[PDB]
Every structure is written in C-alpha cells, then in structure tokens.
Structure 1
Amino acid sequence: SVGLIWAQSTSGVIGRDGGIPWRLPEDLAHFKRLTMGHTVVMGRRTWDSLPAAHRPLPGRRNVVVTRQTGLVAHGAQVVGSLEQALSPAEPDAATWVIGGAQIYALALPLANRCEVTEVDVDLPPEDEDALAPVLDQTWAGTSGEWLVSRSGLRYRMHSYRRL
C-alpha cells in the first residue's frame, strides 16, 4: 500500500520559496498520526526543506529519493528511484509519500490512497510555486467537515482511494 499525503491551499499551492507558505498545527498533528511508525518517502528538496529539529522525522523510517551519491544532512536512507524507495515494504501498513511535487508526480501512478489537507488560506499561485497533483477519474474521495484551527484558518481533510 502506497499513500500520498499532502497539505494544500484551496488554490492548490503546496510549496513556495523552499517551504510551506502557511502554518497549521492541526495539520502537523494529523500528518504525525497518519505516518508515525511507518516509512516516509520524500524528494531530496523536501528533505533539505525540513527544519533541523524535524530532520529526520522522528519515529519514522526516512527514505530520500535523489540522483546524488548521498547527502550532507544526516538521518536519511538514500535511494535513486521511487521503485527502490518502495520495495521492500512494511507489512500491513502504508508507505507514505510525503512530497514534494516532483516525488508526488512519480508516485501518483503507483498510489492506492491520497490523504489531503485543504487549507482555506488565500494564496494566488506564483510563478515558482509547487502545486498539488491533480487527481483523475481513477480516484474516489470523501471529505470531512470544515474545521477551524486555533490560529483561525479553516481547513478540512479529503481522503481518496483508487477505484
């Protein structure tokens, strides 16, 4: 089982200036609950984007997809392709692909699940933004209710499964 998990603005932005252009504690907790104890696979730019306190993601096996021989920043297992990242795999549990846009594009054809947090923050897409992948007719989804964060932003979760 391969799942993609991401947070996006309503406009579809996932990344800007090497980071995430909002702060949503409730999404961080959701992401931690879904991924704890599992393998997380990410692109190398996302690895380098993590705040140092959070790299590697504690309690998870951190796999980083790169074309380089290895990385200066410690704590990852490097692989040269998504296929190498995914096999061997943890039994009875998802491997989670946690970004960014390039790695989501590689993983989308292989995935069985997508877990999306939508953040109602007004962020018109800018030229260099990383955007969320678009889901085609092979996906069926359900959506939770709109929630209000302690910081005032409205957000909600969408969950998709391959038909």
Structure 2
Amino acid sequence: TSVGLIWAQSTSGVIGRDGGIPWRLPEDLAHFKRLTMGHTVVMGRRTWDSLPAAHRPLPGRRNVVVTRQTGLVAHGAQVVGSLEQALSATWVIGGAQIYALALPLANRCEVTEVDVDLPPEDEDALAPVLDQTWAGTSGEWLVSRSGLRYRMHSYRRL
C-alpha cells in the first residue's frame, strides 16, 4: 500500500513534550481525523500511550502499535514488532522514532506547522526533516480557535 506520514510540529520541529503535544489546535485534530478516517494508522508504543483515554483506540481506523516488547497488548489495537509488519492507504501517525523508521517507505507527508516558539529541549520528540527530494506546497496562515496560528503543508516524494 501507499504509506503517508502525518504530523503537527512547531516551527522549531517539536512534535511532543512530557508525554503529550504542547499545544491545542482543534483544526489540526479535525484535519488529522479527516485524512486518517477509515485507514490504518500506525504508531509507536509511546504515541499509543499518549492518546487521551477517551480517544484510544482511535475510532474508525485500524490501530497498529509498534513495539519491541513481547506480549504487549493494546486493547482494541493490533501490535507488531517492526514497521514492515505494520505495512502488510496506511498513515503513520508518529511519534518521532516511528516517523524515522517510516520516512524511507513513504511517498506523501501531510504536515501542520504551528506558529509557537518552543526551543527544543531534552527529551522532546522532534519532527523528521524532509530533504529537497520532497516536493511541497503550503496553505495559508490561519488563526486557530485556540489562539495559535497554523498552516498545512503537503509533500510528495519526487
């Protein structure tokens, strides 16, 4: 199947801190739900842990959790020991370690950029860096109901 990555980052590249996402952006949650609904969503074990309880597993999607643990069970989800096992449309939904594993297999990235100043600090989860072999285009800067500015980028591998 075609593999896409989807993530939201601060301009500095931070995607996660302290076991969660360091902003609220309802329009990004709607974007994420819309693009992933009905598809397989592949995530690292720490991202599974980070889902708020009311949203775990993510409804309407085949949830696949990647772990090195034996006998990890994730209620309502499928558990695999490698990205290759996860990939047999598929969306990789994070976090930083699973993005790095999936990027060589992906042909599409959908990125939300959040206009917040979050200097990377120890133990932050960071977004993957796309090189110039990714074609990209950007939507407009928009003001979120949360107060923050954001915009969506779409990338396709050449």
Between the aligned partners of 1:143 and 1:133, the Cα distance in structure 2 is: 17
1:76-102: per-residue Cα shift (whole Å, max 9, x none)? Answer: 100111011001xxxxxx200000000
1:68 Cα deviation from its structure 2 partner:
1.2
Runs of 4+ in 1 over 3 A off after TM superposition: none
Q: 1:148 maps to which residue?
A: 143
Partner of 1:14, secondary structure, is strand
Counting matched residue pairs gives 157
Note the C-alpha offset of 1:72: 4.8
Return the offset for 1:70.
3.0
Q: CA deviation at 1:73?
A: 4.1
Question: Conserved in 1, the CA contact under 8 Å of 2:14 and 2:124?
Answer: yes
Q: CA offsets per residue over residues 38-71 of structure 1, 9 Å max, x none? A: 0000000000111110100000000001111233
Provide TM-score, normalisation by structure 2.
Answer: 0.97
C-alpha separation in 1, matches of 2:66 and 2:153 = 26
Give the secondary structure class of the aligned counterpart of 2:85: helix
Q: Higher mean Cα deviation, 61-70 or 1-10?
A: 61-70
The answer to whether the 8 Å contact 2:39/2:90 transfers is yes
Gap runs ≥5 in structure 1: 88-93
Q: Write the distance in 1 (CA, Å) between the matches of 2:117 and 2:156.
A: 28
State the identity %: 100
The alignment's C-alpha RMSD in Å is: 0.9
Distance 1:143 1:9 in 2: 15
Task: Please tell me whether the aligned partners of residues 48 and 73 of structure 1 are also in contact (alpha carbons under 8 angstroms).
Answer: no
SS class of match (1:53): helix
Structure 2 unaligned residues grouped into runs of 5+: none
